[PDB]
Amino acid sequence: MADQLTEEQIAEFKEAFSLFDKDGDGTITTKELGTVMRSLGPTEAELQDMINEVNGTIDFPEFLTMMARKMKDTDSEEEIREAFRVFDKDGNGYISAAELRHVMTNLGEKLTDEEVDEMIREAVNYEEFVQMMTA
């Protein structure tokens, strides 16, 4: 989906897409697409994938849906890191099993006690626990 990004990121991408080429129809070529991607924030495989997903013209929604992937990935990684860095006053990166089980049972969403016990048995480090839960 396109709702994983932030409004400021969309505004910056729109400003770059408008200022990169002439006014009005701001369509760009493949080389222009790569240049705009390098200016906004570079591998040849990503450029080839963006060209294949898009003759040789790239409009606004194509560039948006090509850029959204890595942006949302980095945003999710940063959010997970910031969430794992909080709460724990020690900050060492590990927590007790009892505290983790209590946080998973009495907080989060709607998880039964049996499901929480199964998740605890299937699994400490917060990042490793999140990676094991995501699978």
Author numbering: 1 to 41, 44 to 56, 61 to 129, 137 to 148
How is this structure described in the published paper?
Similarly, two classes and corresponding structures were obtained for R615C pRyR1 in the presence of apoCaM, with 69% open, and 19% closed channels. Of note, despite identical conditions used for WT and R615C pRyR1 in the presence of apoCaM, there is still a larger proportion of open channels for R615C pRyR1, further highlighting the inherent effect of this mutation to facilitate channel opening. The N-lobe can interact with the Bsol region in two different modes, with the open state complex involving a bending of the Bsol region, induced by movement of interface 2, just like in the WT pRyR1:apoCaM complexes. Comparing the open structures in complex with apoCaM, the differences between WT and R615C pRyR1 are much smaller. Relative to the Nsol, the movements in the Bsol are dampened to 1 Å around residue 2443. Similarly, the relative positions of the inner helices within the pore are almost identical, and there is little additional movement in the N-terminal region. Despite this, the position of the inner helix S6 and the width of the pore are very similar for R615C pRyR1 and open R615C pRyR1:apoCaM. Thus, upon binding, apoCaM pushes the R615C pRyR1 into the same two conformations observed for WT pRyR1, with one corresponding to an open, and the other to a closed channel. As the ‘intermediate’ conformation for the R615C pRyR1 without apoCaM corresponds to an open channel, the addition of apoCaM thus results in a redistribution of such open channels to a mixture of both open and closed channels.
Ryanodine receptors (RyR) are >2-MDa membrane proteins that allow for the release of Ca2+ from the ER and SR, thus mediating a range of Ca2+-dependent processes. Each forms homotetrameric assemblies of ~5000 residue long subunits. Mutations in RyR1, the skeletal muscle isoform, can cause malignant hyperthermia (MH), central core disease (CCD), and other myopathies. Here, a collection of cryoEM structures provides insights into the molecular consequences of MHrelated RyR mutation R615C, and how apoCaM opens RyR1.
